[PDB]
Design a binder for this molecule. Structure first.
Ligand SMILES: Nc1ncnc2c1ncn2[C@@H]1O[C@H](COP(=O)(O)OP(=O)(O)O)[C@@H](O)[C@H]1O
Ligand SMILES: Nc1ncnc2c1ncn2[C@@H]1O[C@H](COP(=O)(O)OP(=O)(O)O)[C@@H](O)[C@H]1O
Ligand SMILES: [Mg+2]
Ligand SMILES: [Mg+2]
Ligand SMILES: [Zn+2]
Lengths: 30, 287, 280
């Protein structure tokens, strides 16, 4: 199930986004 | 650690909808191409279709061959066609699209031969994307209007929701549709590009790929200098995209069109070009 | 044989409206700047104003300093501010229109008033096409022959048309580089403009080379094969060649010290020291 793995990675990114704090991530990047 | 390429996708079988963009003269036009190339090649039993809304008629241009109001099989292939064409939000955007749907289906039916996978070139003005949220913010006040009436306004709203759900269900499946974006190694790209992604997620849209372009690889002074720019940047990306198809891509000197030049390019959307090895092939489109 | 610069314009006195664009990431954003810079400097008794519709909030960005819904004097100067029906033409105008008012608010409610105004046509090009649009609506008002709206539009456009249509308060620089898609597409631009009967006398070519690395000089030839193209067919134009300093270039500092070359059109050999200065 190589594909799924991709979905998990995408989802992991989402958790990172939900978890990460885009407003905060944006602040550090800025 | 995932893959740098779009090979993995060059061969999707369940992708009947791909969206490509990149706020900038970052060059995604050619993108929109070099992709709709790698596909037909490696799925030739697939009538594909790549179209643009960029008034500029950039496609043909980037093709040294004219296209227009109706599907025309590329000259050189037999499976890759090309086709250049209420105050509330989302509105216009959708319809805009909508009519397209029909205007497209005309072109398959009235054509006879039908298309398999379809490839977009979001206006340089970005995306009419907006409208996905549409039926949500429209859910609250649909019930407000309901509570009071307890017919045409309700009609249109339900239709939109319907359409979006049907398009959305197929659309809001990462398997028929997803969203590559092109963007290069510079502040305004990055940020702005990054931004792109947000609104997309904001539309609950799968999206797994990044095409960085016009890179350097100085291995002239300002060159290597400049080079560092990009580099200071590439990384930025890599770090924050482990889970991404962050596809580095090289920069062949100057104009690059002619299906010839183009194909022989896009290969590197697969075997992500390597300077040292594949470095010969480069100056080939530099003449 | 005319001039490569915009000096001649950096100092217009009767220009209260300048339109800048260039279908492409050809870079006209910085254009929109490097111009609204050279002006105030050399006319400081002129409160100028440079704004953009590019949602991207590119200006500030390109400025490393934030701007927004209302006129804000640059940080470093005291005269250059910055501020971020289905028929045709329609939307476009109004779009504008509201701007008018929204702007005049900002001078009046401000107190201090602006002298020359500098535009940054959406990367989406220009929504100013409507002027071309009113004359049509006129022919068919007669065909059909509501009066209120029609007269208002005419009025507005005339205030807008005159004004814009006199080559002395308003005219139109465009940015665009040395490549097929630029050229053509840029060229196109011009047509629609003329198609709007709009004076327009200037061309800024950008990200040039001057390799005097292999692919460099190679690439160089690209541009060259092209520069000429232009020169030939612009007998009478301010076709302003401009050089390309490595990588990001912002910070009012870097910028000003750039725009100088919008005057003394940069020369590789001479002014070549000044370049790598913004390359760090
Ligand atoms: N990697 C590259 N090397 C050389 N030229 C390129 C490369 N990518 C794009 N181009 C050229 O860069 C310019 C901008 O590319 P384009 O695809 O039109 O961008 P966009 O569609 O994002 O506006 C075009 O003239 C194109 O031929
Ligand atoms: N001559 C130049 N040398 C180096 N970088 C430049 C030059 N002109 C523009 N840039 C950079 O190129 C990119 C595009 O320029 P920009 O002004 O944003 O263009 P446009 O507004 O037409 O989109 C920006 O990152 C900008 O900093
Ligand atoms: Mg394009
Ligand atoms: Mg800009
Ligand atoms: Zn070089």
């Amino acid at each position: 199930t190589e594909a799924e793995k991709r979905r998990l990675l995408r989802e992991r990114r989402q958790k990172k986004f939900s978890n990460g704090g885009a407003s905060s991530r944006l602040n550090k990047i800025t | 650690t995932v893959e740098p390429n779009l090979h993995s996708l060059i061969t999707s079988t369940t992708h009947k909808w791909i969206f490509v963009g990149g706020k900038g003269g970052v060059g995604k036009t050619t993108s929109s191409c070099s992709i709709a190339i790698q596909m037909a090649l490696s799925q030739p039993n697939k009538q594909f279709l790549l179209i643009s809304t960029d008034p500029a008629h950039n496609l043909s241009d980037a093709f040294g061959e004219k296209f227009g109001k109706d599907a025309r099989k590329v000259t050189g292939m037999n499976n890759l066609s090309c086709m250049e064409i209420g105050s509330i939000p989302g509105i216009d955007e959708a319809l805009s699209f909508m009519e397209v749907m029909k205007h497209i289906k005309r072109q398959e039916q009235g054509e006879g031969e039908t298309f398999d996978t379809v490839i977009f070139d979001t206006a340089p003005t970005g995306h009419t994307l907006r409208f996905l949220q549409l039926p949500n913010t429209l859910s609250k006040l649909l019930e407000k209007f309901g509570e009071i009436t307890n017919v045409d306004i309700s009609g249109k709203l339900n239709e939109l929701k319907a359409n979006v759900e049907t398009i959305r269900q197929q659309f809001t499946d990462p398997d028929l549709t997803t969203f590559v974006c092109v963007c290069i190694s510079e502040f305004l790209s990055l940020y702005e590009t990054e931004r792109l992604i947000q609104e997309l997620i904001s539309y609950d849209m799968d999206v797994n790929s990044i095409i960085v372009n016009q890179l350097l690889f100085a291995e002239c002074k300002r060159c290597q200098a400049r080079w560092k720019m990009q580099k200071k940047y590439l990384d930025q990306i890599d770090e924050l995209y482990e889970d991404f198809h962050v596809v580095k891509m090289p920069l062949c000197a100057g104009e690059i069109r002619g299906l010839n030049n183009l194909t022989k390019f896009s290969q590197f959307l697969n075997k992500e070009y390597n300077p040292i090895t594949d470095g010969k092939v480069i100056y080939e489109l530099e003449d």
